[PDB]
Design a protein around this ligand. Structure first.
Ligand SMILES: O=c1[nH]c2cc(Nc3ccc(F)cc3F)cnc2n1Cc1ccccc1
Length: 331
């Protein structure tokens, strides 16, 4: 066991091993920037807030730990270290998580000017490469957006917080019951279109304005999609809205790579059953410069049977404590 030291940052008291130095605040948790003297890397340290205050808090603490311990992918935020100042389970009251400090997120990267097509190719390829890994473990991000994409100054990308309304899929906006993993593919399309054009694709003012902007581009549901909506009140709610066909994306993204327009067409389909997948998008000719079918790995099967269990606080805390003691750091 290493020696810990204490210091308060922005009213938050931190208890970390001496190995992590130069704590600097970055932003249900609190994140700090730090220098790992053991490896020489700049790391991000997250202190979980009130991790065992309630059953819901304890299950969320166990969920984030099991999640990060399983993700071992260069484009997915993984676990560099987990520690706690406690020496037993009865003392176990705080949890700290350490990962890479990329330096920034994709947020507001385009507010002044758009990115080149080659720059977008490299950024979107990394998101999809990590999404194929995340989806292979049967995990849906559900809420992908520029702030969930950790990026460094060389545009190397890692997906963050896996498992604003401008990047949310239409089926989630309409509160439909069934979702597949392509709800994240819709988010990537909204992100990709924003990087190419310099402007948000669907900057809706409220909830109905968000849906109305979406249906103006992708069109109202055709006959094949209407036949799959079970609720009759939901069916007439789209016939409540005005009818208009799907736009030709070539007439929307003027001056863009025709391969980029073709990829957005496959990503922004209203019917999520016909939406392109992460593995299929990696094989698109738009990523010919970066696609390597032998360097796009999938994840080990991920056990999520704990999500349907109702346990006590002391049981979730003991399960979380077992995952801390069994953590083996990466190479
Ligand atoms: O680069 C990173 N790393 C980040 C880690 C975490 N939280 C976190 C998750 C899991 C952990 F295990 C530990 C954590 F700290 C959050 N945003 C991160 N950004 C993006 C960013 C954005 C602006 C300024 C600096 C950094």
């Amino acid at each position: 066991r290493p020696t810990f030291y204490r210091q308060e940052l922005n009213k938050t008291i931190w208890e970390v091993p001496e190995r992590y130095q130069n704590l600097s605040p970055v932003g249900y948790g609190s994140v700090c920037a730090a220098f790992d003297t053991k490896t020489g890397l700049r790391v991000a340290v997250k202190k979980l807030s009130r991790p065992f205050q309630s059953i819901i808090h304890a299950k969320r603490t166990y969920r984030e730990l099991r999640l990060l311990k399983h993700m071992k992918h260069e484009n997915v935020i993984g676990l560099l270290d987990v520690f706690t100042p406690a020496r037993s389970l009865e003392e176990f009251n705080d949890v700290y998580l350490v990962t890479h400090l990329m330096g920034a997120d994709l947020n507001n990267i385009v507010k002044c000017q758009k990115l080149t097509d080659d720059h977008v190719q490299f950024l979107i390829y990394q998101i999809l490469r990590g999404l194929k890994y995340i989806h292979s473990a049967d995990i849906i991000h559900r809420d992908l957006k520029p702030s969930n994409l950790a990026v460094n100054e060389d545009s190397e990308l890692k997906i963050l917080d896996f498992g604003t309304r401008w990047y949310r899929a239409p089926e989630i906006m309409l509160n439909w019951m069934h979702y597949n993993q392509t709800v994240d593919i819709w988010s990537v399309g909204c992100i990709m279109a924003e990087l190419l054009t310099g402007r948000t694709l669907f900057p809706g003012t409220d909830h109905i304005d968000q849906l109305k902007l979406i249906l103006r581009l992708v069109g109202t549901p055709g006959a094949e999609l209407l036949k799959k909506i079970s609720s009759e009140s939901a069916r007439n709610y789209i016939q409540s809205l005005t009818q208009m066909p799907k736009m030709n994306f070539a007439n929307v993204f003027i001056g863009a790579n025709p391969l980029a327009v073709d990829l957005l067409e496959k990503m922004l389909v209203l019917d999520s059953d016909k939406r392109i997948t992460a593995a299929q998008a990696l094989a698109h000719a738009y990523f010919a410069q970066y696609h390597d079918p032998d360097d796009e790995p999938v994840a080990d099967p991920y056990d999520q049977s704990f999500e349907s269990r109702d346990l006590l606080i002391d049981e979730w805390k003991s399960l979380t404590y077992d995952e801390v003691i069994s953590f083996v750091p990466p190479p």
